[PDB]
Amino acid sequence: GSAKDVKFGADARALMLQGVDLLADAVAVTMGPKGRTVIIEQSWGSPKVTKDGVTVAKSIDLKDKYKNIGAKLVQDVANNTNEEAGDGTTTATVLARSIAKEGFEKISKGANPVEIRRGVMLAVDAVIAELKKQSKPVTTPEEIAQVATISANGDKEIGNIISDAMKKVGRKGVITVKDGKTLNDELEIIEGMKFDRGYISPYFINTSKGQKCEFQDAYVLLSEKKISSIQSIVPALEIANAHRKPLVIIAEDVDGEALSTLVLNRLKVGLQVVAVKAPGFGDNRKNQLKDMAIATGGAVFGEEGLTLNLEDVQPHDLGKVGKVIVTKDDAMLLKGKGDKAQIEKRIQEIIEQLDVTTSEYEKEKLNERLAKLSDGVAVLKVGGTSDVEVNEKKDRVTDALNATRAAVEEGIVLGGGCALLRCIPALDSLTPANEDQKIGIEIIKRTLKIPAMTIAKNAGVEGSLIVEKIMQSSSEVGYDAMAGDFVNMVEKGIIDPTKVVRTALLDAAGVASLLTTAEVVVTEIP
Amino acid sequence: GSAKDVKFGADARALMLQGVDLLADAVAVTMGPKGRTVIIEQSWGSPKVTKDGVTVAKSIDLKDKYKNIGAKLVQDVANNTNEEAGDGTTTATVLARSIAKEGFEKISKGANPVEIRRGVMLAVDAVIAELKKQSKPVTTPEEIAQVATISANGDKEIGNIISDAMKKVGRKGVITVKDGKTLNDELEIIEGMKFDRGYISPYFINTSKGQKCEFQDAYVLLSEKKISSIQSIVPALEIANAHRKPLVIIAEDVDGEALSTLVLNRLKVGLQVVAVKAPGFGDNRKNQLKDMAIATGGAVFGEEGLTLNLEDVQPHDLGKVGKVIVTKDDAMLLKGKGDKAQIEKRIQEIIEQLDVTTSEYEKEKLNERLAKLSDGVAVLKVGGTSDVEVNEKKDRVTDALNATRAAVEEGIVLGGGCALLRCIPALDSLTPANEDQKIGIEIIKRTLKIPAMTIAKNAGVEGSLIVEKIMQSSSEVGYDAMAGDFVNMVEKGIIDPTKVVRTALLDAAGVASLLTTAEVVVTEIP
Amino acid sequence: GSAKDVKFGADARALMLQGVDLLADAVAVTMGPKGRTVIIEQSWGSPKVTKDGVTVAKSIDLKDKYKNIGAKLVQDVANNTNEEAGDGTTTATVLARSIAKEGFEKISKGANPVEIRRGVMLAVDAVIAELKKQSKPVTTPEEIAQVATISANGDKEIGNIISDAMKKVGRKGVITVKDGKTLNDELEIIEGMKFDRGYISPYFINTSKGQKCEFQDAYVLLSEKKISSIQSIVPALEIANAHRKPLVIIAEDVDGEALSTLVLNRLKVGLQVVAVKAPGFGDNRKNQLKDMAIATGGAVFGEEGLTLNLEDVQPHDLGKVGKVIVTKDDAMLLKGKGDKAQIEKRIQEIIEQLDVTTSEYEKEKLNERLAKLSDGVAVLKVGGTSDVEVNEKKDRVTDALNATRAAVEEGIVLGGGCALLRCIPALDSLTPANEDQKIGIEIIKRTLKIPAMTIAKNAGVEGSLIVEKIMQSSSEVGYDAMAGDFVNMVEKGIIDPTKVVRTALLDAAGVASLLTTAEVVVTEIP
Numbered sequence A, B, C: 001g002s003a004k005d006v007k008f009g010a011d012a013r014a015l016m017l018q019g020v021d022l023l024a025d026a027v028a029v030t031m032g033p034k035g036r037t038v039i040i041e042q043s044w045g046s047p048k049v050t051k052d053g054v055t056v057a058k059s060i061d062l063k064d065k066y067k068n069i070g071a072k073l074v075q076d077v078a079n080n081t082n083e084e085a086g087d088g089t090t091t092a093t094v095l096a097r098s099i100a101k102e103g104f105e106k107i108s109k110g111a112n113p114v115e116i117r118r119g120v121m122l123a124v125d126a127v128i129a130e131l132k133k134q135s136k137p138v139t140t141p142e143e144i145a146q147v148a149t150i151s152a153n154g155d156k157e158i159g160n161i162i163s164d165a166m167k168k169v170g171r172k173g174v175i176t177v178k179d180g181k182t183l184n185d186e187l188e189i190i191e192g193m194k195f196d197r198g199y200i201s202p203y204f205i206n207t208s209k210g211q212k213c214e215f216q217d218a219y220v221l222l223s224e225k226k227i228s229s230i231q232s233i234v235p236a237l238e239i240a241n242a243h244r245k246p247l248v249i250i251a252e253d254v255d256g257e258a259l260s261t262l263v264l265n266r267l268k269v270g271l272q273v274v275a276v277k278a279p280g281f282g283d284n285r286k287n288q289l290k291d292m293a294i295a296t297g298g299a300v301f302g303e304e305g306l307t308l309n310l311e312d313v314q315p316h317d318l319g320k321v322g323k324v325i326v327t328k329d330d331a332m333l334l335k336g337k338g339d340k341a342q343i344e345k346r347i348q349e350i351i352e353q354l355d356v357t358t359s360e361y362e363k364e365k366l367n368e369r370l371a372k373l374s375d376g377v378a379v380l381k382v383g384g385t386s387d388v389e390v391n392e393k394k395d396r397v398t399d400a401l402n403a404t405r406a407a408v409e410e411g412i413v414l415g416g417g418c419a420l421l422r423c424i425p426a427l428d429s430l431t432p433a434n435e436d437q438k439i440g441i442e443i444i445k446r447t448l449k450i451p452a453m454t455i456a457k458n459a460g461v462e463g464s465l466i467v468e469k470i471m472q473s474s475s476e477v478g479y480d481a482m483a484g485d486f487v488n489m490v491e492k493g494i495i496d497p498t499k500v501v502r503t504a505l506l507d508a509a510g511v512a513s514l515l516t517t518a519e520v521v522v523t524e525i526p
């Protein structure tokens, strides 16, 4: 293969550690309320600004291939943490560096770094256990706003808006985040099944106020194929006019003579019909029409396999909806009736798809908001006066959102970094099998102090003193680095989801303890 | 990814600040009446000359990647301001530099630049509030010519011609700007229903002078389909020859046997017919033809909503009409009857839409020019002796136009830079939460002085003397830098639209305050 | 975008001025009777020699990007002048340099170069006014030959031959210029209808001397389609034998049985017919045959739309010509009768075509020459012993032609450069609004002296002595630099069209006064 070059022992360890230390030093300035931002040059556009640890970590590759090995491993931990939890990234990085340094330093001739790894892993299990003991599940929706506002770097309006959306959509409902054009944040809430397609003809309009077509207690007709012929359209209208209900028709397109029947029967003898194009993306629209079919109760016409033809309809083949609103741009359907078991089956299906298949073709999420919209969904239109600002704020909002979900689903524990600090006594009551494992437990025991010392150090104060003042102090009290003084932690609102504290530490130790086992590294020649 | 290189703290800040300062220094020479032009090399052609801050800013990228980061952020400011307001670009640039410098200088170890950002943004909100209090909405059309003339760098003829066009088409009517072939400026006004399509055959000609079709009290025919067919044309001509009136026919195309009837039968006892292609281009042409339909009052043929066929016409068909003039390139219709419910329906439609698809789809204005063309539209044919001159003058005219629109839609406030200067006392009555925010408010307090000091500095005078002379002076008085002495501002005509002053400041502070938060910069290696 | 580099103030100004001065110094050696030529290397061929200012200016681009900016602006001046007037190019360049230098030098800190520009433009308006006052419209056809001979650098034979062409074709008729193979210039004048197509068969020959078919008082038949069949051709011959006239037939082709009828009736009962191919391209042929239709009076057969078929002809559907001569290679038709109004309509149509016709396809002129014949066009076959000679000379004759047309259409004024010198007192009676404008008027006042001093300097004499001596002298007298002494200008024939003198100065001052406004220059890095 390709010509290569290899390096041996503490020399190579010192190089890899140089890389780790560089990347860690770059990410770690972002940590905490007094933390600071990192600008990253973009190849094509104006540069990114961020406070996100993982996005800083991913941005840094290095010319020196060994230092690049270290860097790649630490960004691996930060990425794993971001994927598994969505916050706590800088924390995972500084933890990983601490384990890597303290690991590397203790290696000698007689030492057995694999066994030391076993010891640190023992220490991590023992720590997360005590963390779970410390966890107190969220209750009041004030705590939601607290976790959100702290995860959003002290922006109270963010955690307020998140609390509102989570109240009005539910704690495990769908919230999504997107760019505003407005200079301020907006919470929009959609209920129903909205999609971005409008009436084919203006003539369908009934209200003249807003220029909408508004219907209630309506029927739905779903066609996967185009409907140009009269032959397949007419029975669907006779059946609709029969039971005196309005009919909405969703199709790949509605045109030829069919549209002529629709807008003649519409303008004359005042029939209540609308026709709108299918949401429309090739094979995607098929899945969407299947979604709306299942939600509104009823079936899709045209070619799947079993073909149901448009000429032979029955009232049980249509759809039934509480309300419908359509405009030139978009269509919303509301309170559609169908089997709730079967629709939750559908949502369970799409989620179980998406989770094993995370492409950057995220229309699978666009499905999930739609079929879940009969509880509701919240859109978070983030503001700001410039794109880079909105990207920063949106990074923070997504962080706070993921943090709140982790909080509701697992629990909350003390903020600052105190939650890890309180786990040290649990390590003190361990029973190491040998010197190596004891070294591992010592490594983790030192490493737990780090996040608080870093958050304090960013504040401009004597962080490692502050850590010790915290340790002499009671369990409920910690250091408010923004206010610059000690406080009850949970009372003052400084709290972290347990899931994030668990995952950051677990990933960081998981990769770094493996890194410390290295004795020889092999790299490509420039 | 690509190999990268990172830099830490006030060093990287000093580099980025070098970039900011370079670009700002380049932009700032253009500012005010005594400002000066910037030549920019073009790759293919002869070089640009400009006084436009944003066009100077976009032209400058830098080899040093950090300085280039600063530069790119400043271009973000100037571009955002130009997009959102269309003037005030140089102002936004010098403001952004001032906030960036004064920001960077005040950071230390104990400082919290994000919180300083919060203080700055507080200060900007507090300032724009007082700006809105200061705003006095435009009334006399002398004020229009004043804001135009100041935004056009003292060219009175520009603001005169803009005032004339805005009078003759209305303050929210359509004005557009284009190159003359003439050495002087011209105002042309189009009235009617103008669109860019010319005959189909030459044999139609009636006046021989200009080679136009000039018709009066004519008929109009509207066909969404091609008219190539046998006997679908004839009743429309028999009915036209009946009431001895000329007919213009607009269609997707007119050709085959139809055209053969039209000519040669045009060349017979001078009855007047003309045929022209529909304004066209796919799905747009339907909306355009419905526009001309509703304007002349009713009109439908071709395939359908409600179906009207071309064989069955009546003398009241389909809309009417007044006068018509068409040439080889373009067609104009004039005196359409009845109508105004549907046009107000149209403005009600455009005002309610575009808000969705808000991110590039300005064709809604292309609609608005058409359906409002029975009031008018203005073309601004700018003159000059050379293309580069023409591009300069046109840049200035477009600036003055956007400025006049911002003035009519939001308000006017004091020129010079005094409007920002008067907002300082509003900052003096603020209640900062902490030292960081106080630093921010101080930053804005200093930065507000900048535009006035810069306009004076370009004059060759002691700008910061003049700033303080203005501050000691009364609210109504400021510095006329062209005349070189103090005057009543509003009386002398030196006034700025409030929209431009708010948007420049908001964007500049918005990006620069984010820039000051940086602690680490990451860039690609050369 | 692309990495760039910027420069500030008089430093950058001195570089741009270096470029301007280089290009100007190169062009200016060509000026006047004692001026000299410039050789320009061609990439592919043997080098150009020229006395044309604009062609020198366009040839010079510069490595130093700033100097190249200056260079691009001055060649912009020379190109604008050549496009707008066709002579006076060197003059426009030296004027532009003078305005640029005198502009740049007068700039300081307190100065306002845009306002200085305003003063300059004021001065130029004031100058061209007095120029128009000085203008005396051309009368005698001696004056045309004078303007031509002076614009052709003293070649009397050029202005003689141009005078002859202008007499024999008219003052606004068509003269064109092209290479001879003869070593001397020749004037050919074409009138009639010439095109390069010959008899299909030798049997058509009538003269036996030259082998031509010569006809008079003939008919012409025009067929856009092929003529193979008998039944379409025969009535056209019966109608010809009826009225005992010769028949010329022009067609896409004439062959099959038709041709057999033609040369049978030709060879056995000496009928007077010839048949010739259409001038031939594809779509061009339609316009050519319809041209010949319109010229000869009559109509084209075959399919346009309304189709007239060859079976149904009438004598008023043919064509009628004073004379016809045909050979193996070419066909000439003479004194064709038709509506002169309709033919002038046709020429008015083709000129209005070609003028807006962004075309490398010059056949529109090849059309225009044809339909203009028997009104006439003159071709100027320029001689010389070598291609480079022919091209230089052709440049000069084209200059003289454009100059004569400018003279007839606007006027003539004093040569030498005296006409501007006489305009200086008009500057003396101006009322400047401020110091800047006064600087501008002073700049123009100095620049006006330049062209005469340059023409004198090229002579090898003390140009600025000569300028002041002419200024001390009376209005009618100036300096004959070729004869080397003072003379009455108009009497000795040294005169310049007013259009060229106005346009050169107006363009030069127009861009240079803009150049002087620059404070910052931005250029791409090598």
Ligand SMILES: Nc1ncnc2c1ncn2[C@@H]1O[C@H](COP(=O)(O)OP(=O)(O)O)[C@@H](O)[C@H]1O
Binding pocket: A030, A031, A032, A033, A035, A052, A053, A087, A088, A089, A090, A091, A092, A150, A151, A153, A414, A415, A416, A417, A451, A455, A479, A480, A481, A482, A483, A494, A495, A496
């Ligand atoms: N006022 C505060 N006092 C003490 N610690 C805080 C305060 N606000 C936030 N923190 C701590 O900051 C940490 C969050 O780090 P952050 O900068 O959001 O990056 P990440 O979440 O990716 O680690 C949490 O562990 C939290 O305990």
Ligand SMILES: Nc1ncnc2c1ncn2[C@@H]1O[C@H](COP(=O)(O)OP(=O)(O)O)[C@@H](O)[C@H]1O
Binding pocket: B030, B031, B032, B033, B035, B052, B053, B054, B087, B088, B089, B090, B091, B092, B150, B151, B153, B414, B415, B416, B417, B451, B455, B479, B480, B481, B482, B483, B494, B495, B496
């Ligand atoms: N005669 C004048 N006296 C004082 N200030 C002026 C005068 N003319 C224009 N200004 C000021 O110049 C500013 C406009 O700057 P300009 O050169 O148009 O660049 P931009 O508008 O792109 O920032 C306005 O704020 C206005 O107050």
Ligand SMILES: Nc1ncnc2c1ncn2[C@@H]1O[C@H](COP(=O)(O)OP(=O)(O)O)[C@@H](O)[C@H]1O
Binding pocket: C030, C031, C032, C033, C035, C052, C053, C087, C088, C089, C090, C091, C092, C150, C151, C153, C414, C415, C416, C417, C451, C455, C479, C480, C481, C482, C483, C494, C495, C496
């Ligand atoms: N015999 C002459 N005496 C004085 N001036 C002359 C004479 N011949 C030509 N000129 C001047 O030369 C100028 C023309 O310059 P020329 O060399 O033709 O290049 P261009 O026409 O491109 O400027 C005219 O202004 C004319 O007055």
Ligand SMILES: [Mg+2]
Binding pocket: A087, A088, A089, A151, A152, A399
């Ligand atoms: Mg976070």
Ligand SMILES: [Mg+2]
Binding pocket: B087, B088, B089, B151, B152, B399
């Ligand atoms: Mg401006």
Ligand SMILES: [Mg+2]
Binding pocket: C087, C088, C150, C151, C152, C153, C399
């Ligand atoms: Mg000449």
